[PDB]
């Protein structure tokens, strides 16, 4: 698994690979790890597929009930609901979730939630097994307030290297762009990112 | 260690021409020690017959449970239980104890009173329905019974001919099993009558 | 709170009577008459159907005579729905005994258990009592042919011949007049039909207004057999006795 | 066990083998692995056979009650959501690995569910011991915008690969076709490429071969 | 004996007075509301009355956003209205989580009517003195109007009316659908369907409205929304340039 | 009128009154008189004990809650035992969990909430006792009057019970005098003894009749009875 | 384990139970009566876990006696054995099972025939002419299979048990300190005080 | 008939809940309290009836804080008001625990609203004898609410309840008419003092103490704080100047 | 909070009458007339759709409901009470039978389950009886076709033909004259329309009358093909057009 979310000038972009494995066999090579919990709040999923799907479904339920009563929730609020489930059920869950959402006031925000159940607000966050191989690359190439063109290239180059070295990562690079304009789905095939 | 290998014993069922047959050994044991030569494993509730293998305490318990349930069924429905319906009753009763199961191998045999259709069914310890048109086997000599039935069996056998098939399949399988034997009994089920025959076999 | 609306179902009257039990017994006295007669070679159960129509399917109808066990049966007087609740629990209890001891439940033990459930609703719970009076007809290897009766209070007694429902005072007098200890089932069948016909509030006692059952040990079998009479079988025996 | 699911232009098709095993011994040579959630939503089971049968009938019962409550045709996403939440609660102890497919007012759908409660969506899926043999054929011959007949051929070929190559699979091929505007056609024993050859000898015993000690008539009538 | 009119038990006539008195509580607010279906939309119109000058006009509302698709207008006291609003929102969220799809308008109505039936049968839970009108554009049934009452009764409507002057609006709508012969309002845009609903509110009640006198809820495909005071004002200019 | 709305505490009257609470308040007026008063350094409780017979003992009126807090009762003694026991536990909870002496103001809030829960639910009755809580915390000396209604008021001086208006009028008149009695416990006691004597009508205060308690700056809550109150007679 | 033996002859059921109670390294008692009277004509012997063995036996005794008072009637040996079996069947799947092996020795007054039942801790009932629990059967069964007849007298049954005990006292490594022998017939339950040198 | 006012959840023939209306009478009998919404915050003020000189000044605090940004003031049965604030504090902590952000005022208003309405649904519970004026500053501006015994609440430019609610509302209506652009935080505190002094004329037989609190975005950083010292005395002097 | 109504609301009066049952039966009498007729090869159940408003769609309100593919139900009395009973009847068919025996319950046993729920509403604490009488028509393999009436008391009776509601006394008398043990399904529908016409005051057409049958299996309504033993539901609700076609031959 190789997942990341990067804040930029106009908002935030979430990125993921499409490989889920059962041992050394790829059970699904076209997986969507970028899950919507609210209109402009999305999450990246790593670890147990059954756990992360169950958490995201409960968060989507909580945020739907929130919107019915109080209106559009903040990214911090969504990250808090994710954390509450992850922290309180830490003994039974294996989930590494990156929470990224767009706000009109707060712009783009990224919150990473590792195994333990802690929250960390970051300009950008990398997670999954493949993220270990790109810690050096991302720290040297990341800049604040990049353009959409630059951020897509940054995630595309990072995840391509993550896929290259990690056996658990692979398939296609999926991207979700969160700005004031709306939600944009992006996809990049092996024939493109492997030769970068 | 294995609860299905403490007591021993085997049950076999077969279909024929307008008839079904069910057979079992009479052995009850405690590991190597032989305890009883009269432990019958076939029971009947109306016209539906049930053979149970495995742990003997569960064999007795389930017999008392299915007698409990078929009696209440008969009072409510105002009719006898049917082989197809009883098969589902066994399946649901076994799955009710999914995480604390009865260590058994139940076998349903009988003829539908309305259609005249011969019916046999098999179950694991947790209640998976094994509905085969030919034969159903269960017990500590299941491998021995599978080899006997696959070779000896032929479709549409007469009640007198099917008796010879099921008896030879049971006896020669029991003689290759340490935990099976000590007498045998065969039921020949027909639409109108049921014949019970005790078989002469090795007593070792 | 809710104290205002509480009728207090489980309290004594100044006289020492239970209001709801006495009023339930009043409800039974309007229901169809059920008569049980115990003979030397069997038991007879006869009951009069309350409120009948021409378009009522009698062949599939069961409102008074119910089967609890292979050896035990009941005659119902009062609320049919309340009876089926108790009849179901009695069926479970009979099977619980059979599972425990591998023997058929003795009649009295089944009667006592049902009567104890009736008593429960009389002492605690704050709920209304069961408006049902049973006649128990059963057989066991201890006492043989047995006849019991239980009412909303939870009191049960043994009988040679008893009537529940409407016109019991008149029915019991007729039974006490013609009953003898050396009776045969065929004679008991006649007495049960004659007593009902004389106590009927309707014009004539016909087959479509009756439920009939006999519990006999077959001489050519050696086992006790229950026989709930079909609409045609009731019609036949009604002519044989001399009622037509 | 080999189970597959293939999406075509106007619906979805599922297929399975008919071999049930208790270890290395075949228990059933012709069992039904294609189960029915609802009239137009069908399920293929792998793993613990008692678990797959019961979880299908439980959710199928609840789907029927939901359909009657809402006055609407059952949806695949409904059957999917109820199956995954049930399997997640038991933390994988209920060994049910399912391929659920069907048609509804929203269209055609194909999903796969694992015992722990994870779900996957695709155009071609395979589960069981013969999954790798089936997927190999699926990855080689699958194309976008398949016709009905092409989908039946592709799914059946994938199952055959399980029959011949995987030891946990064998015997016959069961197929179920689910089209958008039509009734679902369940094809029991669509292919029978494993017919037992005639025995070299008849083993019919002469009457009186087995020795009988005692004989009696059993009483059925009460 | 005389407590049959105090709790939800049958009277000698076979009536339930507590339910009947809960119907009377619905007219306590003295507010009329109507609902109509368009070609691909559903519109609810409710009277907005602000008696006290110290009140915040933006907070005075009887139209609720239950989910993304479903909206609800209530006739009756606001404490019971918000009780039914919160429950409906909770039921809507749970349905989506459990069954994987958005709860339909009729299903929510049936669910809320089932709960209202419980208060009609069980003694300790009093009936809510409110009438709930649910509106949406269902993905299967299209534009939908479903109304629930304290009795636990619910049914679908081509168009409905609720309030003290309900019969005046009901007969006014009845005479239009007898004239037009179709069951909906034949118009493409929702704006003109709102215009229709306001015009017939004026014709039936016999009262002119300002931007603050009305409250509008519009249901479209995949969205329900309430109009602001200036949105209603724009709609009132359009109908004024016709009469 | 009154007969229809006094059946239980849950029922409101047409005027908005709670008669069961009002009847619980009447139990205090029937009870024996007790006086509470304070200055800037010390807080004093003076209570008149009541006996059934001349052969009976005088029932205690003052209960110690903590080393820095205590109260006097007027009305039902078992109800005072329950409320004082709860206050003993609340003082104990603060000292064990937070290592903190419970504020007398917060102690009044806790007694308010516990009394309130008895007035809103069915089956329950209001407490039939009035309490005068004194204490010394981080903000100095305190005196609080507890009422079964839940109303708790912080006061310089107060009196509850039978004929308690006489003592209350005295303390209201002597307000400027006893407030300035700082660093002198004995003179504050005498101000309370003269206060409780204004409520006397049946008999005079004697040796085994009077009950006095004090808590202050360097004085833990101690109760004086019998021989220890003889010098104030 | 302790020695528990049973034999059903023509008119009676004979039970033989070992007298020794061993805890760890020492024999604490050599005169323990490992049997309980459930009813006038029904006797039960027991062996197994230290605490469970007596606790279960007295629990069954209390229930049968409760039934006898309520119904003013003695349950048949079959009805008693079925009750015992169900209790052990319920116990085997509980939090902590009764590790008790029992022999039911009763005389049916209605049938006028002796009856012997063998139930282990799992709840496995079997009606037998002769029965044993634990390792007892390994030494005794061959002697019982050889000499036993259904028409044997009480005197003949005692001689066969004597032969069974002599084999146990020779080949079995444990010293069970002899046996207490009890007869169950139509007249009730009596104890054979002279088996030490019969 | 009659007796519809005896039980809580019972509907009267005209569709009313008399027990709730009876709880309103307890509020009307209580002390007058007010709330003023300004251009960036809210100002709360309450009357404090001095029963005796024995009452310690500035000690018996009536205005309560919920969370760190909400201020609550109520009229009627004071213990009932505390019970509502205790629930409000539990509900606010539950919101912050799950959603991280402090509870919005409209969000908090409904939480109290649903709880008070719940006490009108059963005959086992008594309706709240308080009308609570509350509010604060959240994500989008300031909010002021007033909650009734029925559970009914609305947003307010100015709120008034208690003994002198009529005089208070009349003076609050003048402020809305004279200041359409919006009153300031400094002006609202001074005015809140004037409103009570004029509303005290309804209970002028007894002496009273003034208690003011405020929550302003620019003055108190959006947090609830009590008006103390010079600012409190400046408010008293402003009210004492315009009373004559 | 907490239900303090733990006592019975239905109690025996001095005369022996159970008040709440009698008053519930009175509510049934005020209800719209519904009827049921059993033929040799089917059962028919019919009722009038009493619309509260012409603006309201009568299609959305179904007085006749499917319980199982072989069993249907109709009522007279309180609509909301019927709807919740159908929800419970559908659930009890699965929970108490289908999840046990793998097949749908016979008519008589499902009727018994519904009757039990209605009996409990007479004895349990803090509840009133259901203000409805139900007519349940169904088919099973071993009993054939059957029709049952379930009352608020929880009592049930099997019927050849019966009617409940407003003009039930007049309808039963009409049914007694026209019914015979040799009636065909199409004949039973003909009498059903004739009997219901006497009760209906206003418009008598396929839009104002709700009718359903329990007859032959419908393979076109099953939804799937493949299993030979599965032949389709026996319950079929007649459409507005199907009713109008039989009204022309009245």
Swiss-Prot record, chain A:
Signal peptide: none
GO cellular component: cytosol; nucleus; proteasome complex; proteasome core complex, beta-subunit complex; proteasome storage granule
Name of one Pfam family that matches: Proteasome
Enzyme class per UniProt: hydrolase
GO molecular function: endopeptidase activity; threonine-type endopeptidase activity
Domain of life: Eukaryota
Entries under InterPro entries matching the protein: Ntn_hydrolases_N, Pept_T1A_subB, Proteasome_bsu_CS, Proteasome_sua/b, Proteasome_suB-type
Record field: catalytic activity: Cleavage of peptide bonds with very broad specificity
Record EC number: 3.4.25.1
Subcellular location: Cytoplasm; Nucleus
Record keywords, A-Z: Acetylation, Cytoplasm, Hydrolase, Nucleus, Protease, Proteasome, Threonine protease, Zymogen
BP-aspect Gene Ontology terms: proteasomal ubiquitin-independent protein catabolic process; proteasome-mediated ubiquitin-dependent protein catabolic process
Principal location listed in the UniProt entry: cytoplasm
Active site (record annotation): 1 (nucleophile)
UniProt-listed PANTHER family: ATP-DEPENDENT PROTEASE SUBUNIT HSLV, METALLOPROTEASE TLDD
Protein's name according to its UniProt entry: Proteasome subunit beta type-1
Species this chain originates from: Saccharomyces cerevisiae (strain ATCC 204508 / S288c) (Baker's yeast)
Lineage, highest ranks first: Eukaryota, Fungi, Dikarya, Ascomycota, Saccharomycotina
Swiss-Prot record, chain C:
Source domain of life: Eukaryota
SUPFAM superfamilies: N-terminal nucleophile aminohydrolases (Ntn hydrolases) (SSF56235)
Function: The proteasome degrades poly-ubiquitinated proteins in the cytoplasm and in the nucleus. It is essential for the regulated turnover of proteins and for the removal of misfolded proteins. The proteasome is a multicatalytic proteinase complex that is characterized by its ability to cleave peptides with Arg, Phe, Tyr, Leu, and Glu adjacent to the leaving group at neutral or slightly basic pH. It has an ATP-dependent proteolytic activity.
GO-annotated cellular components: cytosol; nucleus; proteasome complex; proteasome core complex, alpha-subunit complex; proteasome storage granule
Gene3D superfamilies reported in the protein's UniProt record: Glutamine Phosphoribosylpyrophosphate, subunit 1, domain 1
Cross-link Glycyl lysine isopeptide (Lys-Gly) (interchain with G-Cter in ubiquitin): residue positions: 99, 198, 230
CDD domains referenced in this protein's UniProt entry, alphabetically: proteasome_alpha_type_4 (cd03752)
Entry keywords, A to Z: Cytoplasm, Isopeptide bond, Nucleus, Proteasome, Ubl conjugation
Xref: SMART domains: Proteasome_A_N
Record gene name: PRE9
Similarity section: Belongs to the peptidase T1A family.
Record localization: Cytoplasm; Nucleus
Miscellaneous note of the record: Present with 17100 molecules/cell in log phase SD medium.
Gene Ontology biological process terms in this record: proteasomal ubiquitin-independent protein catabolic process; proteasome core complex assembly; proteasome-mediated ubiquitin-dependent protein catabolic process
Name used for this protein in its record: Proteasome subunit alpha type-3
UniProtKB/Swiss-Prot annotation, chain D:
Regions that span the bilayer: none
Recorded GO MF terms: endopeptidase activity; threonine-type endopeptidase activity
InterPro entries: Ntn_hydrolases_N, Pept_T1A_subB, Proteasome_bsu_C, Proteasome_bsu_CS, Proteasome_sua/b, Proteasome_suB-type
Cellular localisation: Cytoplasm; Nucleus
Pfam family, one: Pr_beta_C
Annotated catalytic residues: 1
Catalysed transformations (reactions): Cleavage of peptide bonds with very broad specificity
Subunit description: The 26S proteasome consists of a 20S proteasome core and two 19S regulatory subunits. The 20S proteasome core is composed of 28 subunits that are arranged in four stacked rings, resulting in a barrel-shaped structure. The two end rings are each formed by seven alpha subunits, and the two central rings are each formed by seven beta subunits. The catalytic chamber with the active sites is on the inside of the barrel.
Protein name: Proteasome subunit beta type-2
Annotated source species: Saccharomyces cerevisiae (strain ATCC 204508 / S288c)
Lineage: Eukaryota, Fungi, Dikarya, Ascomycota, Saccharomycotina
Gene for this chain: PUP1
Curated annotation (Swiss-Prot), chain F:
Domain of life where this protein originates: Eukaryota
Pfam families referenced in this protein's UniProt entry, alphabetically: Proteasome, Proteasome_A_N
InterPro entries associated with the record: Ntn_hydrolases_N, Proteasome_alpha, Proteasome_alpha-type, Proteasome_asu_N, Proteasome_sua/b
Residue numbers carrying Phosphoserine: 13
Keyword Ubl conjugation: yes
Subcellular location: Cytoplasm; Nucleus
Record-listed cross-link Glycyl lysine isopeptide (Lys-Gly) (interchain with G-Cter in ubiquitin), residues: 190
Keyword Ion transport: no
Entry keywords, A to Z: Cytoplasm, Isopeptide bond, Nucleus, Phosphoprotein, Proteasome, Ubl conjugation
GO biological process assignments: proteasomal ubiquitin-independent protein catabolic process; proteasome-mediated ubiquitin-dependent protein catabolic process
GO cellular component: nucleus; proteasome complex; proteasome core complex, alpha-subunit complex; proteasome storage granule
Family: Belongs to the peptidase T1A family.
Record's miscellaneous remark: Present with 7210 molecules/cell in log phase SD medium.
Subunit comment: The 26S proteasome consists of a 20S proteasome core and two 19S regulatory subunits. The 20S proteasome core is composed of 28 subunits that are arranged in four stacked rings, resulting in a barrel-shaped structure. The two end rings are each formed by seven alpha subunits, and the two central rings are each formed by seven beta subunits. The catalytic chamber with the active sites is on the inside of the barrel.
Descriptive protein name: Proteasome subunit alpha type-6
Lineage: Eukaryota, Fungi, Dikarya, Ascomycota, Saccharomycotina
């Amino acid at each position: 698994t190789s997942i990341m979310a990067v804040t930029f000038k106009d908002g935030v972009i979430l990125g993921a690979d499409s490989r889920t494995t059962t041992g050394a066999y790829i059970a699904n090579r076209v997986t969507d790890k970028l899950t919507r919990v609210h209109d402009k709040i999305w999450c990246c999923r790593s670890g147990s597929a059954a756990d992360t799907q169950a958490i995201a479904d409960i968060v989507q339920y909580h945020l739907e009930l929130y919107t019915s009563q109080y209106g559009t929730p903040s990214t911090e609020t969504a990250a808090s609901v994710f954390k509450e489930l992850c922290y309180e059920n830490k003994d039974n869950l294996t989930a590494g979730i990156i929470v990224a959402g767009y706000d009109d006031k707060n712009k783009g925000e990224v919150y990473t939630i590792p195994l333990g159940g802690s929250v960390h607000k970051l300009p950008y966050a990398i997670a999954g097994s493949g993220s270990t191989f790109i810690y050096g690359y991302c720290d040297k190439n990341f800049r604040e307030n990049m353009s959409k063109e630059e951020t897509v290239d940054f995630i595309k180059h990072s995840l391509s290297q993550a896929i290259k070295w990690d056996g658990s990562s692979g398939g296609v690079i999926r991207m979700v762009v969160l700005t004031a304009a709306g939600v944009e789905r992006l996809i990049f095939y092996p024939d493109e990112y492997e030769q970068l | 260690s294995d609860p299905s290998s403490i007591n021993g014993g085997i049950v076999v069922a077969m279909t024929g021409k307008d008839c079904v047959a069910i057979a079992c050994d009479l052995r009850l044991g405690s590991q190597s020690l032989g305890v009883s030569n009269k432990f019958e494993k076939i029971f009947h509730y109306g016209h539906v017959f049930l053979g149970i293998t495995g742990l003997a305490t569960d064999v007795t318990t389930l017999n008392e449970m299915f007698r409990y349930k078929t009696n209440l069924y008969k009072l409510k429905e105002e009719r006898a239980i049917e082989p197809e319906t009883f098969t589902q009753l066994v399946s649901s009763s076994l799955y009710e104890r999914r995480f604390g199961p009865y260590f058994v191998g139940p076998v349903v045999a009988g003829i539908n009173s309305k259609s005249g259709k011969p019916f046999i069914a098999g179950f694991d310890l947790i209640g998976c329905i094994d509905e085969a048109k030919d034969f159903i086997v269960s017990g500590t000599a299941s491998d021995q019974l599978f080899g006997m039935c696959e070779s000896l069996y032929e479709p549409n056998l007469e009640p007198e001919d099917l008796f010879e098939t099921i008896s030879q399949a049971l006896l020669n399988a029991a003689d290759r099993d340490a935990l099976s034997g000590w007498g045998a009994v065969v039921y020949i089920i027909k639409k109108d009558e049921v014949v019970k025959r005790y078989l002469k076999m090795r007593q070792d | 709170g809710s104290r205002r609306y509480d009728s207090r179902t489980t309290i004594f009257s100044p006289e020492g009577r239970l209001y709801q039990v006495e009023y339930a017994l009043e409800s039974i006295s309007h229901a169809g008459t059920a008569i049980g007669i115990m003979a030397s070679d069997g038991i007879v159960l006869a009951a009069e159907r309350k409120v009948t129509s021409t378009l009522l399917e009698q062949d599939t109808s069961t409102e008074k005579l119910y089967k609890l066990n292979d050896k035990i049966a009941v005659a119902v007087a009062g609320l049919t729905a309340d009876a089926e609740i108790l009849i179901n629990t009695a069926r479970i209890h009979a099977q619980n005994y059979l599972k425990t001891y591998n023997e058929d439940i003795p009649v009295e033990i089944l009667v006592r258990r049902l009567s104890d459930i009736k008593q429960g609703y009389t002492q605690h719970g704050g709920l209304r009592p069961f408006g049902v009076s049973f006649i128990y007809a059963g057989y066991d290897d201890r006492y043989g042919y047995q006849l019991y009766t239980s009412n909303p209070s939870g009191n049960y007694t043994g009988w040679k011949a008893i009537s529940v429902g409407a016109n019991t005072s008149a029915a019991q007098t007729l039974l006490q007049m013609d009953y003898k200890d050396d009776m045969k089932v065929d004679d008991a069948i006649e007495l049960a039909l004659k007593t009902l016909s004389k106590t009927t509030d309707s014009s004539a006692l016909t087959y479509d207004r009756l439920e009939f059952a006999t519990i006999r040990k077959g001489a050519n079998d050696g086992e006790v057999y229950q026989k709930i009479f079909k609409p045609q079988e009731i019609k036949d025996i009604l002519v044989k006795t001399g009622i037509t | 066990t080999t189970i597959v699911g293939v999406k075509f232009n106007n619906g979805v098709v599922i297929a399975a083998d008919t071999r049930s095993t208790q270890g290395p011994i075949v228990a059933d040579k012709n069992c039904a692995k294609l189960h029915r959630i609802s009239p137009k939503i069908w399920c293929a089971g792998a793993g613990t056979a008692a678990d797959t049968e019961a979880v299908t009938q439980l959710i199928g019962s609840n789907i029927e009650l939901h359909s009657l409550y809402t006055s609407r045709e059952p949806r695949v996403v409904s059957a999917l959501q109820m199956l995954k939440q049930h399997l997640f609660k038991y933390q994988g102890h209920i060994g049910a690995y399912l391929i659920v497919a069907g048609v509804d007012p929203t269209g055609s759908h194909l999903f796969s569910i694992h015992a722990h409660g994870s779900t996957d969506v695709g155009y071609y899926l395979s589960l069981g011991s013969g999954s790798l043999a089936a997927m190999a054929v699926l990855e080689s011959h699958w194309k976008q915008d398949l016709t009905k007949e092409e989908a039946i051929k592709l799914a059946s070929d994938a199952i055959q690969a399980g029959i011949w190559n995987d030891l946990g699979s064998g015997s016959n091929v069961d197929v179920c076709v689910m089209e958008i505007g039509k009734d679902a056609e369940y094809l029991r024993n669509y292919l029978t490429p494993n017919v037992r050859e005639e025995k070299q000898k008849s083993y019919k015993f002469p009457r009186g071969t087995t020795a009988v000690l005692k004989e009696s008539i059993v009483n059925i009538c009460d | 004996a005389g407590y049959d009119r105090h709790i939800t038990i049958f009277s000698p006539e076979g009536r339930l007075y507590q339910v009947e008195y809960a119907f009377k509580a619905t007219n306590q607010t003295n507010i009329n509301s109507l609902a109509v279906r368009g070609k691909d939309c559903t519109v609810v119109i409710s009277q907005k009355k602000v008696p006290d000058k110290l009140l915040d006009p933006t907070t005075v509302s009887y139209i609720f956003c239950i989910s993304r698709t479903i909206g609800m207008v209530v006739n009756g006291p606001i404490p019971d209205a918000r009780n039914a609003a919160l429950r409906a929102k909770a039921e809507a969220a749970e349905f989506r989580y459990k069954y994987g799809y958005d709860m339909p308008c009729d299903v929510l109505a049936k669910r809320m009517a089932n709960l209202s039936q419980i208060y009609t049968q069980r003694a300790y839970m009093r009936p809510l003195g409110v009438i709930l009108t649910f509106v949406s554009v269902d993905e299967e049934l299209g534009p939908s109007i479903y109304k629930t009452d304290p009795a636990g009764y619910y049914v679908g409507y081509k168009a409905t009316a609720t309030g003290p002057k309900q019969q005046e609006i009901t007969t006014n709508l009845e005479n239009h659908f007898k004239k037009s012969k179709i069951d909906h309002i034949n118009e493409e845009s929702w704006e003109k369907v709102v215009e229709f609903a306001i015009t017939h509110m004026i014709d039936a009640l016999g009262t002119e409205f300002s931007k603050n006198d009305l409250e509008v809820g519009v249901a479209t495909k995949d969205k329900f929304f309430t109009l602001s005071a200036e949105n209603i004002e724009e709609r009132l200019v359009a109908i004024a340039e016709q009469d | 009128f009154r007969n229809n709305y006094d059946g239980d505490t849950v029922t409101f009257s047409p005027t908005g009154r709670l008669f069961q609470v009002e009847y619980a308040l009447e139990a205090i007026k029937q009870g024996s008189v007790t006086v509470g008063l304070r200055s800037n350094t010390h807080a004093v409780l003076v209570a008149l004990k009541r006996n059934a017979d001349e052969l009976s003992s005088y029932q205690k009126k003052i209960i110690k809650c903590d080393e820095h807090m205590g109260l006097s009762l007027a009305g039902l003694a078992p109800d005072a035992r329950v409320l004082s026991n709860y206050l003993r536990q609340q003082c104990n909870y603060s000292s064990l969990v937070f290592n903190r002496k419970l504020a007398v103001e917060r102690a009044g809030h806790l007694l308010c909430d516990k009394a309130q829960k008895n007035t809103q639910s069915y089956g329950g009755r209001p407490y039939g006792v009035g309490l005068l809580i004194i204490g010394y915390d981080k903000s100095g000396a305190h005196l609080l009057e507890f009422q079964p209604s839940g109303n708790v008021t912080e006061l310089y001086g107060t009196a509850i019970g039978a004929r308690s208006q006489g003592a209350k009028t005295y303390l209201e008149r002597t307000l400027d005098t006893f407030i300035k009695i700082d660093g002198n416990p004995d003179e504050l006691i005498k101000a309370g003894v003269e206060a409780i004597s204004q409520s006397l009508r049946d008999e005079s205060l004697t040796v085994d009749n009077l009950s006095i308690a004090i808590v202050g700056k360097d004085t833990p809550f101690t109760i004086y009875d019998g021989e220890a109150v003889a010098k104030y007679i | 384990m302790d020695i528990i033996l049973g034999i059903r002859v023509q008119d009676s059921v004979i039970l033989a139970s070992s007298k020794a109670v061993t805890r760890g390294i020492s024999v604490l008692k050599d005169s323990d009566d490992k049997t309980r009277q459930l009813s006038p004509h029904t006797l039960m012997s027991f062996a197994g876990e230290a605490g469970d063995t007596v606790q279960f036996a007295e629990y069954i005794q209390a229930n049968i006696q409760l039934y006898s008072i309520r119904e003013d009637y003695e349950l048949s040996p079959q009805a008693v054995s079925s009750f015992v079996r169900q209790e052990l069947a319920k116990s085997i799947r509980s939090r902590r099972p009764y590790q008790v092996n029992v022999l039911i020795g009763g005389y049916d007054k209605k049938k006028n025939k002796p009856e012997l039942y063998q139930i282990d801790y799992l709840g496995t009932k079997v009606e037998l002419p002769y029965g044993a629990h634990g390792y007892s059967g390994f030494y005794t069964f061959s002697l019982l299979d050889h000499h036993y007849r259904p028409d044997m007298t009480t005197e003949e049954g005692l001689d066969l048990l004597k032969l069974c005990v002599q084999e146990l006292e020779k080949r079995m490594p444990m010293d069970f300190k002899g046996v207490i022998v009890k007869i169950v017939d139509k007249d009730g339950i009596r104890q054979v005080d002279d088996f030490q040198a019969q | 008939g009659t007796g519809y006012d005896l039980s809580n959840s019972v509907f009267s023939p005209d569709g009313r809940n008399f027990q709730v209306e009876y709880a309103v009478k307890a509020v009307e009998n209580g002390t007058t309290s007010i709330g003023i919404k300004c251009n960036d915050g809210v100002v709360f003020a309450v009357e404090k009836l001095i029963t005796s000189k024995l009452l310690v000044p500035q000690k018996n605090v009536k205005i309560q804080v919920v969370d760190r940004h909400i201020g609550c003031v109520y009229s009627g049965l004071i213990p009932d008001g505390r019970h509502l604030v205790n629930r409000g504090r539990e509900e606010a902590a539950s919101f912050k625990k799950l959603y991280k952000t402090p509870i919005p005022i409209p969000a908090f208003a409904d939480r109290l609203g649903q709880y008070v309405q719940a006490h009108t649904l059963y005959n086992s519970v008594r309706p709240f004898g308080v009308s609570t004026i509350f509010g604060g500053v959240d994500k989008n501006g300031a909010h002021l609410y007033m909650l009734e015994p029925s559970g009914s609440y609305w947003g307010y430019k100015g709120a008034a309840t208690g003994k002198g609610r009529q005089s208070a509302k009349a003076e609050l209506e003048k402020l809305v008419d004279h200041h359409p652009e919006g009153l300031s935080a400094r002006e609202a505190v001074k005015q809140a003092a004037k409103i009570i002094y004029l509303a005290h004329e309804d209970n002028k037989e007894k002496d009273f103490e003034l208690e003011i609190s405020w929550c302003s975005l620019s003055e108190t950083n959006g947090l609830h704080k009590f008006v103390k010292g010079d600012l409190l005395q400046e408010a008293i002097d402003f009210a004492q100047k315009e009373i004559n | 909070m907490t239900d303090r109504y733990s006592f019975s609301l239905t109690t025996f009066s001095p005369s022996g009458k159970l008040g709440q049952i009698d008053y519930a039966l009175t509510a049934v009498k005020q209800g719209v007339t519904s009827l049921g007729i059993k033929a040799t090869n089917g059962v028919v159940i019919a009722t009038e759709k009493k619309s509260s408003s012409p603006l309201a769609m009568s299609e959305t309100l179904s007085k006749v409901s499917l319980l199982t593919p072989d069993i249907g139900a109709v009522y007279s009395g309180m609509g909301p009470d019927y709807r919740v009973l159908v929800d419970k009847s559908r659930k009890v068919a699965h929970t108490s039978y289908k999840r046990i025996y793998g097949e749908y319950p016979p008519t008589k046993l499902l009727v018994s389950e519904v009757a039990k729920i209605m009996q409990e509403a007479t004895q349990s604490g803090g509840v009133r009886p259901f203000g409805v009488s139900l007519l349940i028509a169904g088919h099973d393999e071993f009993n054939g076709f059957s029709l049952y009436q379930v009352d608020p008391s929880g009592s049930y009776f099997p019927w050849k033909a019966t009617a409940i509601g407003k003009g039930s006394v007049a309808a039963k008398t009409f049914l007694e004259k026209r019914w015979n043990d040799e009636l065909e399904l199409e004949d039973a529908i003909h009498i059903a329309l004739l009997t219901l016409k006497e009760s209906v005051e206003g418009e008598f057409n396929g839009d104002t009358i709700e009718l359903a049958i329990i007859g032959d299996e419908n393979p076109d309504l099953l939804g799937y093909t493949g299993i030979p033993t599965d032949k389709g539901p026996r319950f079929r609700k007649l459409t507005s057009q199907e009713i109008n076609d039989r009204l022309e031959a009245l």
